[PDB]
């Protein structure tokens, strides 16, 4: 019944500000504390602050009090989280969650928003370069060859990669994107195929980067 819906992902620059909304529905809004948690990549969930939507009484974890503003709209039953002076360390997934107890504080969060990804980077939107990973003879492994695509130097996440317009799915591995030291992302997508099919089947990886409107079809062939 209780449903929490948040706002989409946020593209921000270091020092800017971000607003994340949290629309509630299906329950008495002012009778359940709304908590705000964030989860940095590879780290655990950490509490940043809650709000009692009756009169807007708030509290924060150590450090967040200086630049986080928790508000709500009682009529529309929607909570807000404002973060100013953004640092790269604030790149995380932010959640708004509802306490299960009616008019009490048990910290047991049963209703959760879907989450909002906030990425604070100095980099600007850039489309990827798609380089081939040719099979050759080092990837044949005597029987089953392996070819791939290197989606390098793009920002931000994500990138959609398919093979043969989605017809080739068996043996495909698209790795999680990695953040290079330059601030741009890069991932690889490979596929293992029979060595005999190298000179008969045309293998094309289909890269899609919506933030840059970039769509690339790279045909992978054994190098001359």
């Amino acid at each position: 019944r209780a449903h929490l819906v948040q706002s989409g992902t946020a593209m921000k620059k270091p020092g800017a500000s971000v607003r994340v909304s949290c629309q509630t529905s299906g329950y008495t809004f002012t009778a359940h504390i709304l908590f705000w948690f964030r989860q940095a990549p590879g780290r655990g969930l950490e509490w940043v602050g809650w709000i009692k939507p009756q009169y807007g009484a708030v509290n924060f974890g150590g450090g967040f009090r200086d630049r986080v503003t928790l508000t709500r709209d009682v009529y529309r039953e929607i909570a807000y989280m404002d973060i100013r002076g953004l640092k790269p360390d604030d790149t995380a997934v932010y959640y708004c969650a509802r306490d299960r107890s009616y008019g009490d504080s048990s910290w047991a969060l049963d209703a959760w928003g879907q989450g909002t990804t906030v990425v604070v980077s100095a980099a600007s939107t850039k489309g990827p370069s798609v380089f081939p990973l040719a099979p050759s003879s080092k990837s044949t492994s005597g029987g089953t060859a392996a070819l791939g695509c290197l989606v390098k130097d793009y920002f931000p996440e994500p990138v959609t990669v398919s093979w043969n317009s989605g017809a080739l799915t068996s043996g495909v591995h698209t790795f999680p994107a990695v953040l290079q030291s330059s601030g741009l992302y890069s991932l690889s997508s490979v596929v293992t195929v029979p060595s005999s099919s190298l000179g008969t089947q045309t293998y094309i990886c289909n890269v899609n980067h919506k933030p840059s409107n970039t769509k690339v079809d790279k045909k992978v062939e054994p190098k001359s």
């Binding site: 380089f131 990973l133 080092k138 990837s139 392996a146 290197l150």
Partner: peptide, 25 residues
Amino acid sequence: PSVFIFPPSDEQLKSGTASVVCLLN
């Protein structure tokens, strides 16, 4: 694992950098 190694493409070399990819499948 089935280990493979990929030398950098000439297109990437023409750009200025080189990425050698090793795969553990």
